[model samples]
Target chain A: MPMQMFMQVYDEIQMFLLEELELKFDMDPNRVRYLRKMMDTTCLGGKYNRGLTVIDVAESLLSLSGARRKRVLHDACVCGWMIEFLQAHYLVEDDIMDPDVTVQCAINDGLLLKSWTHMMAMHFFADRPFLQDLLCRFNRVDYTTAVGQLYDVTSMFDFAEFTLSNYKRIVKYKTAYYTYLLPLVMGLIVSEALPTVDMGVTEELAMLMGEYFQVQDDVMDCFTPPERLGKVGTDIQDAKCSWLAVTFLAKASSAQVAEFKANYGSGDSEKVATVRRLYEEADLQGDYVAYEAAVAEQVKELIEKLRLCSPGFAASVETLWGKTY
Target chain B: MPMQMFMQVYDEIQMFLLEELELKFDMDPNRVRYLRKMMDTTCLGGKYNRGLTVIDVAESLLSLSGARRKRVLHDACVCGWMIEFLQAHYLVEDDIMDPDVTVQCAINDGLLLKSWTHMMAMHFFADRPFLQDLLCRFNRVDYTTAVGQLYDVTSMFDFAEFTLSNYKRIVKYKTAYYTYLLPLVMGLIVSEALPTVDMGVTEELAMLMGEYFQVQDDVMDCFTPPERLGKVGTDIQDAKCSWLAVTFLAKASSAQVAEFKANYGSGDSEKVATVRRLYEEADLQGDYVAYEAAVAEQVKELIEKLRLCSPGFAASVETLWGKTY
Candidate 1:
């Protein structure tokens, strides 16, 4: 019932935003029509894992009834939408910056998605006591993500800097804050528990989760083919700082290091094959399995750490833990 | 003296933003250094007319003594930076979307600029009662500018859609909102006169100024040489919907239109000469002179209209009038 309720609000706000574009901005029917299609493709149709996690976390925090329940759910949904909006904003902008570029309209669309995040924040939560905190959190996450993205962009195609330490930093900055921490904390803030909650505890948990998630993604990028993954993994070709790449590089022999560098970051089929062959030699898949198990234990320990001090919030974190994938 | 004071705050905030990145986000000195340089070139070295206009309008609105004067001036300066920050954000993103692209760091830098806008707003204005209104105005302007930018991007290299009405809409949404209306209204909001003032009157005046300014730009794009203009005019080469092109199209004969269309939007020097030759035949330079005179009268008329009802605000608008370039 709650999932169904959460799902409907997307269409509701989608309509409201479209209507405002027309009414407030005097956008014509055709422009509105184009934007509607763009919004549906970019904003909707995703798994909405981050947004749903927000609702899940919010649900765990509060046990309200009647009108208060509805209000909190609605506010949480708005927060959920804001998270997705930021994701869409990042995706649209990243599309422009990516190797195969624009669709130039994508650049402007990114700006629109960002604008909507602020607009929704003001529309739904401006009346809330936590408005400034909410806006600050969103702003800070964006700044963090940008810094992270800057690091990633600069690191691209350069194998010299693909150290484990650097990989961890890139994963933490580029993926963690907006993807994990912001959603969790936004849920806390919307539940009005931001003040009473242990922020650092949540921050630590979020960073760990973000790292694990990205590491998993890096593993998948190399091992998984296009059929299951829906898109071809290009980390090898794009010269990305994948977890597998850094881990294998750490353990590889000097000759192996030179060979891997030569075979990586190119479109030549044999080059990608060489890099993959090296990963197998390093047993990165097995290593990732071990790493995942280790991080799982760390996350469980963190949850217990929070549970000792803040049961309800910890319970909420546990709920999120169950659904992260 | 005021210009020098305004110049210093750029360095002040630049340092503060850099420090926050280092302290809050754990960015390294090298990353901070890169960002500092990016902020300086993109954010500081522009014509800050949009920002300075905020201060000018604010100065016109309030006549104060002692600490009150300093406080209002500081607030206005913060608002002014926010405007420039938005401009910088747009420029950085536009660089990515332009024909010649990143320097992918430009994309992240653009996001950083936008994030800083929200950060500065919260840091400076969050304590004020008008925080929500202030944020909403900024958000609304960004949305409007995005919509405008979308129109321009889609219209690029397509001569069939370059109608006078379309050009006007693009100019207003893309250029006017951020350039003119935003600065003027931000001045009002920062001065705490947002509630008492006639908003439509200001908006109309702003739209008019925005339109006038852009038309002048379109004119200059055709006639001005690189030596005087700093940047080479590429409207003809870029196939932009300049005043000369659209106006000439509006009045050109069928054969003339065919020749002009054949020769427009290409790198061939002879094609550019053909378009320019046709533009002269249509006497667009003379036409722009007429348009400039006509719009100048429209702006003066609107100022008088405001002066009748809101004399102090009118005086501020008039001060803006003198420094638009």
Candidate 2:
């Protein structure tokens, strides 16, 4: 029932999806097994900061005891898992878009994760008065995040369009709503605090958090080694419009920008190395550090406004402030 | 406002999505222009059978005059376009899984189409009591169709799993609900006929129609030429579990089956030619023609049941009886 038990919730949710695949969809055992592997690898292995936050925020919002608390916790977990499944759905397709493991299998896997989110939400939350609101929220988030992905995929490799403005839009749309705002909002919805809370305030804070997280990611893509990050960085090779790239471009001389463009999106290691050298010359790591501090300062001011309404929610935002990963 | 005016509705819905991408998501004109091309090429070019069925059935279900009829027709058109967008979403993603032109861009194109369905529904239907029901129905269909796609993709390239039972499941799951049942049901929902119509009967009839349509597609995959069909047939080359393949395997002698195993799924023209030769030897085209007749007879029986409820709805089913493509 506690937030600490959130990891156990994944197994239950995973099985529910598997059983639906078998009983409702009538998928064969082999196919169900295939889905089990897909869900486990894609959905469960994440840091779960987005999902766990749902339960955390919900628990903080309510003061129920015994079975009442248990029920709320259980519902919150389902909502949490919903976000995770939503993320999984996004990732599975993103992997395919980025050319992941077996585009065909991942494609359907992505679709299943997506459909399962709706199926599970309806099944669990149908009786609740807020069911309509919750379902619509998921749908709205799905639409917003997908649009962001469209921006990201389309803007890539177009070095001339790699402005800081473009980078911020990509981050806020693609990452902010789904990552920072969604789970936090889901928690509020589950606790029925959504109506009381200032939605404008929540959205603003969430976007700020999204920007910070994504900018951190951009920094990590270049600075953090693959051994620690668990995946090779490809922003440069894929010619992605990252904060680091945009910042460097903003500060670099024309010759340096030209040098950057020649090596950008090149899959060759030597070319990538040359691009990294440019980043070092521009001191992107230093820029990222200063940027992090600035965001932390900004986030603190927002947390003050948020605390007057819900201290627990404000505390959750506070936890995100000092993360280096 | 009439059924013939359905094509004009596409422009309004297309602009809504593009505008949301620009105004709501803060996308640049260049990005919006890119999306417009994507939508035109993928969504606009489809046979309007599924979408048109929505408006067609709604008009037939109701008896209203002047402004009342216009309002109904307008809402019906919106609902019809939702299904088209849904199909576009599925097709865009399916293309990527099947390795379409530009895997990355198509991936997000697929996601945007999906989210657009929900966005449009919420935008148009929010005031209606049945909006929740409609939204859930789309989510449900999206899940079922995706599961069918999963079954289809997984069963491909694995000849041992290719059986008539498997083929039927794939056809029913992948094609039937979205293609046959959904638009018909959407019409009912739009006209507020869903509560009165016998749901079990509607579901069974829709499944039958889906099976008939997909089986015909399988036959066309082999029997139809690229020029006539508008695209190259790759079912044999991709080792798909089509109705023809499963039926051919059932009737073919062991020697012929052995010959098929050697040449099936081979991309080479000589190999596909050999597989086609084996089909000729087995008279698969004749089998498909017979199968079509049998399904038409079965569908005729079900349409009679549907006719008692709404003859106009039943008439739409009858129109599909002799379609060659």
Candidate 3:
């Protein structure tokens, strides 16, 4: 039922971005195609679960049936898409600036920035302190994610500098906060139970989910083939302090450490093959499965406790564990 | 003098950044020097008029006494310094990510990101919707600036793309808005005469001041000798679409255009010399003087209208025309 609502909201916010993107073309006229291409490629391409969460939670909370209700619904979707727009801006800037060091990215900075400025002033966020606080939370999460971006970028030149501590630091700041915290908080902001919401529990839950999700991504990098995933795994090739490397390095012998140094962070087929073989012999695939099972159980425990205060907590947690990748 | 206040704010915000920079040490531990290098090199080194405007305007607007006033004063200064922090982050990101075609950039994606995220959540922007609108306006101007940065970065691969129209676009978006409109607006945001303000006239004044300021910078690049400005002029060598070139191009003959093409945007000593000689022959310098007079008059006329609404209209305009460089 929320799917239609989600779709409706998506269209609405898309129109919002469409108008703002048009502003860019009207104001900075030469870059129409540039801005248009930017909007399509980045904003519209997401799964939009975060955005959908905004609409679903808003619908459940508000009982408005007239134009006022429709307007709130419209604003709800705008909030959702603005979240997407925030993600797109971060992606475009990070992608262009730190491709090698950054695990995944592809975006344009100018159009995305224009979208951010326009969406930021949307009537949705400007309507109330309640809405503004949610936007404020988005910024809070965004800042932390941006720090995560910084942690990665600064370590780009010094490959040896990436360790488990630094990796966790980056993941917490850059990935988990935005991935789990923002959408969850945004959902709570619109939900009827806003006043009684325990952000503490949600914060802890988001932290756990974000970490688990990123670890899964690391496993998928090597396990998931390029043909299926559309790109080869470079976590090993990039010397990223991925879950594989972090756990692998923690348990490796001196000889294994030298072998990793020899084969890591390069595009050479032979070196990659050697690193891949090393990972296989070390049984990282099994470790990933084991780790995934542990995290899934952790989320189950967290969600059961959270379900009392947070309505959609179970479904949100479900998405983290439901994936095949 | 506001200089002491400016210095105090500089130290205070530097402490804030210093604390955040210290996060790298806790997370990474090894890169303390690296992050510190980034902070010290970029953040602490600016004249900080934009930053100062925040405090100056905020001080003039708010009236509190005793400990509360001191706290507000500290917060006001933090808000001011945050503006420079904003400037530094962009400079570093653009400078590093897109250098060659960008022509100049000296920053990282993440460090910039970290600063931005941290700054976004600062006490600076959270006082009220009134304060929020100022931050919003800053962002509005900032988005346009990022676009100017885009135009510059994109045209880096094409020297010929920096034409009169294109140059004006770049200046308005990049230099003018932030330099003139942003700080002036900031000043007005906290000033006594906030309501019923003629933003239209102020906006026109800002645009004029921005264009005029950047044009002066262009004139300075060539007119001010290297030692006096403490930097060698690269407008010619960099093939910049400076005001000199824009006006010169408008009236240039084929012979002059060809001569410009021969020497501009290159560090060729002889070619630059030849170009300089050609510029002298075309009387571009004289054109600069005449243009300056016209813009100064425009500002004077607008200031006459804006003075009723904006108290500091005269002092603000004075900086535009009373500069030796």
Candidate 4:
């Protein structure tokens, strides 16, 4: 898992996506140019650790001849980048439907599913029936994420029901499976390591990490500066079901609760500040510290379980820990 | 090919997509409702002629006996409805992008590829290695249409580029393939009629009909009342590379060209009226009549060729000729 190998994986991703676009946009100059621009806009604009993790940890699962090992490792990167494509497109469509009023069946169920198919086909020649099932597994991840997104969106208005259970459900779908487990399973698939490897504990660990990561993100939205994070924090204005919002609702008196709703999601600076001050008033910051400590311990336990269950995945599992930023 | 059989197919499409949503959206009530609403918004909002053609013509291609015939016919509708899904999702994404854009790599290339995979999986249990290659065939239709859309979008601003070449490429992707050809291929795939498919001639006919269908749409934008189409025509103000614009350019004097440029795409009603007057002055009506006659002749020739070469597809091919509305 040398940094150079990760670079090669990154390079291959660009080459593969560009080649697909080249073949598709072969008929026009602007078409090629716009798509090329689009690739950079969405594909490259990310903390690409999820993609790089496949290259970094993929070799650990190998117990084969050098030639066979090399190809599987290469294929692992392809699978990694495909996940990246899914992320990029998801983000683009999300941006398009910024305050989306309804279920984005078109984007989530249809468009993203098609992308995975196109990318898989680049390598999936001759008949690979397993792909229909495996790719369906990937799409299930997308569907879960979208469903979780639904919970998150609906939670925006129904602040009365925005409890820890609702928050947990949203994060599990949004981060755990989509962000972590998807690429990990794909790595195993491409490496042909499913036979030798067991996925149960790794899957469990991913959900744990996904929860931990989302918890960290929600905390940072309140604690971190917009300038530091490189984007404006609109969680309050957006009325997201962040841990602070959920906890504040749980702790506040009835009058305070009335004040919280009136100020939240207003998109005014003072209103956002009022909501932020309310979190501090509710001692949510201290609660977040306790939450983080609890999650760290959970990860530590999972790390031990992962060591016994699938030693090859330990590095990948560890990569996901404490990297929420 | 009876209309009643087509309704049964439509019924199943609703059943299948709804069932998939029911399973996927099981975790939450709002999730269920939103998707049910989404089905109506996107899944059922179009002309559905492309989908029905899949039903109407698939019978001609059938060689299966009795029970198999009934089942294959039923499956033909499923396949036909999958086309509806593709069209529904494409139109949704198009509405999302509003004034989009490029080859639509994510939607056309990625998403539709996956739709074929999903549709193929419903029937493609066991191992159909050919689906690996054949699904790629379906994706090609998606890609071609995206390219055509790219041309149409680029031509919108580059009004000088609104020539027959640009118009042809645009609608071939926009109308011909996306609207016509893509579904035709899917119908073939689902019905297991590939062995009998002489797709070269079919592809040729689809392009012709695609071009013809698109021409009529452009003409309809100006000629058809807003009441009939249910949407007002913005093609003139959108600076669309319509058949009217393309042919009008060919007929305009240099002074009138300046008048056309000044008035075209202006928001003012008087300005649009000026552009419309330019089309009328150029006798573009005569050109449309000539164009329709030429297309009808091509359709007649193709029907005869299809009748002799591939009798089964003649019905589907015929469906496209006069159904531009």
Could you give candidate 2's per-residue lDDT for residues A1-325 as a string of tens digits? 4545786777777787789878888888887887788778888766878887887777777752167677777888999889998888887776675422267777778888888888888887888888888988888988888777777876764367788888888888888888888888888888887877777878887887788888888878877999998788888887888998899999999999889988888889999999999999998899888987887677778888878876777766666444422
In Å, residue A261's CA in model 2 sits off its true spot by 4.2
TM-score (chain A only) for the predictions, listed in order: 0.94, 0.91, 0.82, 0.85
lDDT (10s digit) by residue, model 3, range B224-295: 889997788887876666777777777889888888877777777898888788878889888888887888
Judged by whole-model lDDT over C-alpha atoms, candidate 4 comes out at: 0.66
lDDT of 1 by residue, A150-207 (tens): 7787775326778888887887789888888888888888888777767777888888
Task: Report the poorest 10 consecutive residues by lDDT, candidate 2 chain A.
Answer: A316-325
Whole-model lDDT values for every prediction: 0.81, 0.80, 0.63, 0.66
Clashes of each: 0, 0, 9, 6
Rank list by lDDT: 1, 2, 4, 3
> What is candidate 2's fraction of native contacts?
0.75
User: Candidate 2: where are CA atoms >4 Å away?
Assistant: A1-4, A64-67, A99-101, A156-160, A258-263, A267-274, A320-325, B1-4, B64-67, B99-101, B156-160, B320-325
**Residue A135 lDDT in model 4?**
59
Task: Give lDDT: candidate 2, residue A233.
Answer: 88
Which 10 consecutive positions of candidate 3 chain B have the poorest summed lDDT?
B98-107
Worst 10 residues of 3 chain A by lDDT: A99-108
Worst 10 residues of 4 chain A by lDDT: A99-108
lDDT by residue for model 4 (B35-64), tens: 555555665655678767776666767752
Whichever of 1 and 3 has more TM-score, that candidate is 1
